[PDB]
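Hi R.,

Here's the input for the ST6 complex you asked about:
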Amino acid sequence: VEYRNWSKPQCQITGFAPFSKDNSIRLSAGGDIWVTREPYVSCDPVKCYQFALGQGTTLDNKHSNDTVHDRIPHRTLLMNELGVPFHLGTRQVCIAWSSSSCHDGKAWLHVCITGDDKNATASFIYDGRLVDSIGSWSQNILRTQESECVCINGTCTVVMTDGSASGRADTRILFIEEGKIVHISPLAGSAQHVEECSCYPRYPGVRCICRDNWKGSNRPVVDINMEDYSIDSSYVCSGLVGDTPRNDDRSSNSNCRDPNNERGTQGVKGWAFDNGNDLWMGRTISKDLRSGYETFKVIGGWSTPNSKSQINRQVIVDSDNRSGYSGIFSVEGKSCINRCFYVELIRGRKQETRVWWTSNSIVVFCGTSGTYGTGSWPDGANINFMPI
Amino acid sequence: VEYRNWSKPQCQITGFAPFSKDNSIRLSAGGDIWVTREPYVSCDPVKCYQFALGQGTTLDNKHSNDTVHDRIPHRTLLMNELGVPFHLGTRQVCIAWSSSSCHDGKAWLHVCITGDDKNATASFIYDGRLVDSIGSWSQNILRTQESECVCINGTCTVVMTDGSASGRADTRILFIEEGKIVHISPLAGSAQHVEECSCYPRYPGVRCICRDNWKGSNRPVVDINMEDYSIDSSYVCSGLVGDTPRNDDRSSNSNCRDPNNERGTQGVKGWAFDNGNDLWMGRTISKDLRSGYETFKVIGGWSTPNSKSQINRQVIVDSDNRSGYSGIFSVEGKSCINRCFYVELIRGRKQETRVWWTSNSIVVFCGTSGTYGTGSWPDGANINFMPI
Amino acid sequence: VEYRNWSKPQCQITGFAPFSKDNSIRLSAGGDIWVTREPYVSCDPVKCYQFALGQGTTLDNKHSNDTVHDRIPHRTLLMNELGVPFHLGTRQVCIAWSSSSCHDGKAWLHVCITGDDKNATASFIYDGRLVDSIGSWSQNILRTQESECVCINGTCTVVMTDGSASGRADTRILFIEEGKIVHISPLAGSAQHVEECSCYPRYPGVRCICRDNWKGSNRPVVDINMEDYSIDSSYVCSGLVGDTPRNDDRSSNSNCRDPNNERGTQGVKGWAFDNGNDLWMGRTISKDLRSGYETFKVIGGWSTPNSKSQINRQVIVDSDNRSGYSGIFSVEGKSCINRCFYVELIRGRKQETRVWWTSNSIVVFCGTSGTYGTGSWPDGANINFMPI
Amino acid sequence: VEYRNWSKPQCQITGFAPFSKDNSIRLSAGGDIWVTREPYVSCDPVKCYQFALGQGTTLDNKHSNDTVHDRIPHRTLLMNELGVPFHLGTRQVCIAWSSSSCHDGKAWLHVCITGDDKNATASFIYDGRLVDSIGSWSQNILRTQESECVCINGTCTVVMTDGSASGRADTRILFIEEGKIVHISPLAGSAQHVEECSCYPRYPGVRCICRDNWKGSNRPVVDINMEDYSIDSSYVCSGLVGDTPRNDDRSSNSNCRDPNNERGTQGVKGWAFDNGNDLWMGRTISKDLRSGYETFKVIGGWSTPNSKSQINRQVIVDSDNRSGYSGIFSVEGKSCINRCFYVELIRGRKQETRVWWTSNSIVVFCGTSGTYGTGSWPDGANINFMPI
Ligand SMILES: *[C@@H]1O[C@H](CO[C@H]2O[C@@H](C)[C@@H](O)[C@@H](O)[C@@H]2O)[C@@H](O[C@@H]2O[C@H](CO)[C@@H](O[C@@H]3O[C@H](CO)[C@@H](O)[C@H](O)[C@@H]3O)[C@H](O)[C@H]2NC(C)=O)[C@H](O)[C@H]1NC(C)=O
Ligand SMILES: *[C@@H]1O[C@H](CO[C@H]2O[C@@H](C)[C@@H](O)[C@@H](O)[C@@H]2O)[C@@H](O[C@@H]2O[C@H](CO)[C@@H](O[C@@H]3O[C@H](CO)[C@@H](O)[C@H](O)[C@@H]3O)[C@H](O)[C@H]2NC(C)=O)[C@H](O)[C@H]1NC(C)=O
Ligand SMILES: *[C@@H]1O[C@H](CO[C@H]2O[C@@H](C)[C@@H](O)[C@@H](O)[C@@H]2O)[C@@H](O[C@@H]2O[C@H](CO)[C@@H](O[C@@H]3O[C@H](CO)[C@@H](O)[C@H](O)[C@@H]3O)[C@H](O)[C@H]2NC(C)=O)[C@H](O)[C@H]1NC(C)=O
Ligand SMILES: *[C@@H]1O[C@H](CO[C@H]2O[C@@H](C)[C@@H](O)[C@@H](O)[C@@H]2O)[C@@H](O[C@@H]2O[C@H](CO)[C@@H](O[C@@H]3O[C@H](CO)[C@@H](O)[C@H](O)[C@@H]3O)[C@H](O)[C@H]2NC(C)=O)[C@H](O)[C@H]1NC(C)=O
Ligand SMILES: *[C@@H]1O[C@H](CO)[C@@H](O[C@@H]2O[C@H](CO)[C@@H](O)[C@H](O)[C@H]2NC(C)=O)[C@H](O)[C@H]1NC(C)=O
Ligand SMILES: *[C@@H]1O[C@H](CO)[C@@H](O[C@@H]2O[C@H](CO)[C@@H](O)[C@H](O)[C@H]2NC(C)=O)[C@H](O)[C@H]1NC(C)=O
Ligand SMILES: *[C@@H]1O[C@H](CO)[C@@H](O[C@@H]2O[C@H](CO)[C@@H](O)[C@H](O)[C@H]2NC(C)=O)[C@H](O)[C@H]1NC(C)=O
Ligand SMILES: *[C@@H]1O[C@H](CO)[C@@H](O[C@@H]2O[C@H](CO)[C@@H](O)[C@H](O)[C@H]2NC(C)=O)[C@H](O)[C@H]1NC(C)=O
Ligand SMILES: *[C@@H]1O[C@H](CO)[C@@H](O[C@@H]2O[C@H](CO)[C@@H](O)[C@H](O)[C@H]2NC(C)=O)[C@H](O)[C@H]1NC(C)=O
Ligand SMILES: *[C@@H]1O[C@H](CO)[C@@H](O[C@@H]2O[C@H](CO)[C@@H](O)[C@H](O)[C@H]2NC(C)=O)[C@H](O)[C@H]1NC(C)=O
Ligand SMILES: *[C@@H]1O[C@H](CO)[C@@H](O[C@@H]2O[C@H](CO)[C@@H](O)[C@H](O)[C@H]2NC(C)=O)[C@H](O)[C@H]1NC(C)=O
Ligand SMILES: *[C@@H]1O[C@H](CO)[C@@H](O[C@@H]2O[C@H](CO)[C@@H](O)[C@H](O)[C@H]2NC(C)=O)[C@H](O)[C@H]1NC(C)=O
Ligand SMILES: CC(=O)Nc1ccc(C(=O)O)cc1NC(=O)C[NH3+]
Ligand SMILES: CC(=O)Nc1ccc(C(=O)O)cc1NC(=O)C[NH3+]
Ligand SMILES: CC(=O)Nc1ccc(C(=O)O)cc1NC(=O)C[NH3+]
Ligand SMILES: CC(=O)Nc1ccc(C(=O)O)cc1NC(=O)C[NH3+]
Ligand SMILES: [Ca+2]
Ligand SMILES: [Ca+2]
Ligand SMILES: [Ca+2]
Ligand SMILES: [Ca+2]
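And here is the predicted structure with ST6 in place:
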């Protein structure tokens, strides 16, 4: 077993082909399936596994009541193979409410976070044993990537933030190799609030399209240099730019430099990636809520400030449907490394009222160089059918 | 791991011995088991796995209502080992309503199809990652083999059709090696409507006994040359010839050349195979419906037009029982490659009315050179016992 | 992987130590667990697996009604590891109502029998594929060992009988190597009715303590020579001799030669083994029914006709409890090959009336050279608790 | 595969980081999960597995009624990977009410105990087969470690006691290598009643912090020499000393030599470990009951009699919550061997009355050299939600 490093050109994609779905909510109406949220997937050198943060209970349990709450001690990192849902025999990889996982080539890595909001502990597990841990550095809800981290040449990198969500915070990028932290570096560059980074490998470094939860609808970029521990911020030029809440497409701005101050506050985890001066990107269909999902390439979306010219769009989830979080995950090809993405479709309480629980299901597509068609692959759970 | 190529003489069989059954419907009355249809099996160099197209739900679910519909986004390729039914921990290999799977020796291949009837995408997955994809080429429900494809010397071949079911259509045979499409060839020869091909390897090529859904009760043959990408049609000489609806055994014709124009329209996926001038073949017992199943060798059924002389018959499912789809699957012996076959036994709605769902179970036999006996191995689900 | 041959001295045992139990019935009252009967276990070079003949249904199913019947098409060979019960994800190894399984060293072997009582087929599966098959030879319920077969030097041997249960029958001993039958030999020696043989390896041959279901309470012996295909009968000298029904211990006879004609008819599968002139043996506690179980060595029980002198007894199941079938299974030690045994504890219909199903659970002990204590490890299912 | 021996310096810890939890009780309210108690975990060279003594039944079973009883024949050693709970497909490793398991490097070892209180049998299983067994030596409930045993250089060691709980007893330390007992040695030194030893490897020997159930609140030490078979007793100097019932922290004594005679009788399995003259140790928060849990290092707690000076405390379970048994388990690092610990959280009958069953769940932390935070990770099962 050699170490991962990703020195292959990114695959020239043409859109996204259908790749997987797990129907968690439908099956939850007839079967013992876990209550989760905040999902993600990450492929080890051999196969893709699907993660999520389960709430120490199953859906048709009485314990499902009030799962809208994000943090509880009885929360853990569920992990199965991609395709197989989170049933009663799923292992619980660690105690956690915030997470991230990667695979350096040799073995896994799971940064699991539990504890109180004021003082928390992030445990670093690698190869199955616990190797290190870190304390909160600002006493306000220490959180992490919420998706797959990336390891180049034996060294994994996960960005982490602790401070206030809608107010400035303290973010740093830890370089943790073999489960052991061998460096920490704070944020540098023009970004105002970095939360929930979707990070992909781009030789010889790492890139992150994150979540400004305080000042902007535009998305912060974070650039990590694995050979130097140097950090850099920016923003996505895309005039089309998409977080949620969002302003409007003809009234949205971005200069690639600083928050657009357009409904900035609040948001959702998202993703995007470059191709020269072009930017492939996902977004919910709506500016106001997390309903439906759409992908498209924005011409000059990576190098020209405020470019709002799009080519190649695909509806992933129909506008009359729910979505939520989402992140990108990349996988090595035998020639180039492709980039795929997952999309969490949340059902239940707060939005939906018949029921008192909150859980999600997933869908996932992958970049293709070939031709494709059309559709809308959503949840499919009649709320009147579902228990509670 | 070397590549498959199948350069062994086909085993001289004498009938079919009992091999497997999975009791899916019975167990569905007491346990969380998936709703499926369109099953099939395919043996990797080591063991046989059983596939099916599950409808994003379990049987004793409220989501089971109205599963007679063939296509929905919440449809996926379930896959377990042969014998173990599709329970709540079965992985969902991909999103799909139409499918096919093979194993080139090194790894698997799954051509999964989803999307709209007017524009669909067939995703090609190999070794776990997504390698290519293809768009619909005629805007009318792009479909595929519905059983195992065959790979000789590193190159897999799946025939595919898109166009109208009862009217002519556009069929081609794609040669897709390593998940990557490296050729496409359209249909050639005398066949009028090729759907649902049961294809087996016959060195140094591939043969397919399919489904003429528009003009004939006789079954179309398709011949693929792996070394040339050349195609050829014919029809099965068997005067006995069997699709469904079928005309009558004393009133059925076939000239090995073109549709018999005897109740031609509509049909069902089926199978058959040669042995010199002889043809071993399965068929439902009835001309009108898919009830019961029978196998037998037709003397001169492969080389003499309209031969209706049969030797060696076996009742697989009693005439007072249900059947449906069926396909052949072959497996290499340590001397010759045998040919086995599966039979889908569908229960539920449309035919059966007490319940509102549609699902199947399976049985499967294998060619033998030894002696055998008698029986009728069907479903076994008292509809009055079953939920809904 | 080399072939098994067993050229090690049998371990000098001193009684039986506790080894495993699977609580199938208790767990069946709260969980989806299979309905079975006729269990057995067999250790592959690495670990012990537990088999049984499940009735195509789960216990808290409505299909469980009337499972007292021994034969149905919807019957299969369930197989899990020893300890893990037969839950909804257990694979069904083949279609069968009568069975046997062994492991030649390289891979498994399962002689599975289905079909009609008048004409049946015994399918021979090895290494996962189907290699051969055999037809009934007398038109009256073709049956086999019902426990593990034994393979010495690449050649497996399973004894088989077809004919009437309580009247004479046609028994032969087939030598089936690599799934392929390479010889058959009929019965020889003094035995009158051989059914359900418990066969263990005794270099350089095989020995079987069976079930005379027509003329005797004494148990028939069967001796197979792997190097010659020669057969030999006898009977167990033990005056203590135990089948069921049995006569009485002070009124029981055996001359090691022919049926004692003492309640002879009917019986149950059982086991025993030699040690010089001594015979270790299991038996139900009662002469009339299958209730409780006891083991003990009978001094001179192997070489002296009618010896009824016992030393070293152990109650395995209390007299106020149920038992049933049982067989011996041996396992290689790093110095000598030990001999263990399983005991089927049947509950439900015929005997018990509250419920309408029939199923069993198991317990299993193993020979020890060390010291031991005392107990009674039975089922534990309150019939008033159980469903139906 | 080489043998374990543990010749690495113990890792200098700084407290305990969060490592795992399995939410068994919550999930038991919606799903088929086992009833257990007396849990523990033990890491094989590759991954950690979690053990427990299940009561031959599931929680929402009617058989769960009256599981407060410690011993029944229908009791077995459940074993899954750490994280995955004990669901219906968990294997039952052996019949047992008292247990211990270790891994010599090559394979496992399970000392399983069943039988009557007056005469019992402890079966020794290694590599899957049964190798030896031992009889009770005093006719009064033969018991063992109840946690992981330790094997240095091919030889495993489990301490064992048989005699009266609250009165003196007969304890010895058996050295059982390859499943075979190759020595036994009785207790030596100053200890009065040794029960439930938590034993960790400390090159080149083994150390055990046990349970004086008759004369003291202080905890007995047991020292085993693997190269000599020599034993030695002591007591923990910690004035803070903690068993339950306990006296009071300002009124508790210990001289490292003999029982403090302070509420001595009764107790609970516990743990502790040295670091020079310092002693890291767990304890329930309360002197009277098993509620809540706390860890801390006691300055001079290993070498100075009656030292009650503590530094570095952590609340693991809040004082308003339940705990119970607990043991230490160590795992090798790539530089030093760390020490972790598990904590059983029992719910149900005796204490809790709404329900009639008794079962536990678990939490588990691991030593860290890094920084940490704060919390209380308990069960989380609303007793009003739970069945029965
Ligand atoms: C789900 O929970 C809600 C409130 O959330 C918490 O409730 C706790 C106790 C627990 O479930 C935990 O999981 C959640 O964090 C329950 O809502 C209350 O239900 C009663 C039902 O009667 C409402 O009506 C009034 O209640 C009293 C008893 O409380 C009755 O005498 C009368 O009916 C009275 O009219 C009450 O106003 C509800 N409160 C809120 C804030 O909505 C809910 O019942 C539960 N539901 C389900 C389906 O599981
Ligand atoms: C299964 O579904 C049928 C119709 O199929 C769809 O129904 C939707 C809503 C959903 O289940 C989806 O899965 C299917 O695609 C249901 O049939 C209708 O049921 C009512 C029951 O009352 C019939 O009677 C009349 O209905 C109204 C309410 O609709 C009542 O006030 C009166 O009883 C009235 O007489 C109605 O005519 C049915 N329609 C059809 C086309 O048959 C069915 O109930 C459902 N069944 C089960 C057992 O799951
Ligand atoms: C289990 O089955 C028995 C008989 O065995 C078969 O039954 C079939 C239909 C199916 O279950 C299959 O699995 C078995 O091979 C059932 O017994 C009969 O039950 C009725 C119940 O009412 C008895 O009473 C009389 O029956 C009629 C309807 O049949 C009613 O109007 C009246 O109550 C009437 O008094 C009948 O005499 C029973 N027959 C026998 C031979 O015992 C049984 O009900 C079923 N039980 C359970 C708990 O699953
Ligand atoms: C759980 O068990 C208790 C007692 O424990 C044992 O019970 C056996 C039979 C079995 O469950 C085994 O698992 C346990 O070791 C049951 O308690 C008794 O229940 C009755 C219920 O009615 C109480 O009231 C009186 O009982 C008679 C019938 O026994 C009725 O006519 C009247 O109601 C009468 O007032 C009785 O006093 C209880 N005994 C004790 C010692 O508490 C319990 O019912 C059962 N419960 C559950 C929820 O599973
Ligand atoms: C990235 O990893 C691969 C794995 O070794 C390194 O390149 C391969 O390594 C050898 C020789 O370099 C052979 O496996 C192939 O020639 C290389 N590629 C592949 C796909 O096999 C590569 O050197 C590493 N990257 C860097 C920048 O050092
Ligand atoms: C990943 O590994 C390669 C493999 O060694 C690194 O490339 C080497 O760089 C060092 C000095 O920095 C040289 O000694 C080697 O000769 C270079 N390459 C190879 C293929 O040998 C590369 O820097 C690493 N990547 C990162 C991001 O640190
Ligand atoms: C089909 O595959 C086999 C796998 O290699 C090729 O034949 C075997 O290969 C070698 C030498 O040819 C040995 O494994 C045996 O002599 C061959 N057969 C078997 C069953 O082992 C074979 O050459 C391939 N077919 C063709 C037409 O090239
Ligand atoms: C499968 O592989 C064999 C193995 O090479 C092919 O047979 C060879 O054909 C080429 C030229 O076509 C020759 O160079 C080889 O010498 C031939 N055989 C062998 C055993 O070496 C065969 O064509 C392939 N089958 C198909 C259907 O393409
Ligand atoms: C039975 O099988 C074993 C497996 O090979 C044969 O004996 C072993 O084989 C070699 C050399 O004979 C070594 O593995 C050991 O010396 C033998 N025993 C063991 C336990 O390892 C043995 O020869 C076979 N029996 C006969 C009768 O030929
Ligand atoms: C099991 O195998 C051994 C291993 O060969 C057999 O013993 C050999 O017998 C042949 C002639 O019968 C000789 O050529 C060998 O030299 C003998 N033994 C060995 C260890 O080489 C033995 O017969 C076989 N057992 C059975 C029951 O057939
Ligand atoms: C404990 O086990 C290890 C496993 O072999 C022994 O030390 C290692 O063994 C070799 C040479 O000694 C190499 O694997 C490393 O140098 C050693 N340590 C490790 C972590 O790999 C060691 O000798 C054994 N202990 C004793 C006391 O003999
Ligand atoms: C564990 O194993 C080592 C490895 O051999 C033991 O150390 C050896 O002791 C013997 C004599 O007692 C010497 O022959 C070796 O040369 C010593 N060490 C090594 C690394 O070779 C050690 O005693 C064993 N541990 C225990 C607790 O018994
Ligand atoms: C730790 C935690 O609660 N994470 C969240 C989960 C969901 C969630 C959400 O959007 O529902 C918000 C959360 N907060 C953040 O991630 C802050 N960036
Ligand atoms: C895509 C799709 O719906 N496939 C079918 C499934 C079943 C089905 C059937 O016969 O029930 C028919 C289908 N149509 C075709 O296969 C056309 N050849
Ligand atoms: C084929 C079949 O029915 N086997 C039996 C099962 C159980 C059974 C029994 O004893 O319940 C009897 C059977 N008959 C035989 O084995 C004849 N020796
Ligand atoms: C064999 C057995 O019953 N073990 C116990 C389990 C639990 C238990 C307890 O504390 O609930 C006590 C037991 N007795 C002992 O361990 C004596 N040290
Ligand atoms: Ca925002
Ligand atoms: Ca037709
Ligand atoms: Ca008899
Ligand atoms: Ca005490």
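One thing worth noting: Residues 150 and 201 of chain A are 6 Å apart (CA to CA).

Cheers,
M.
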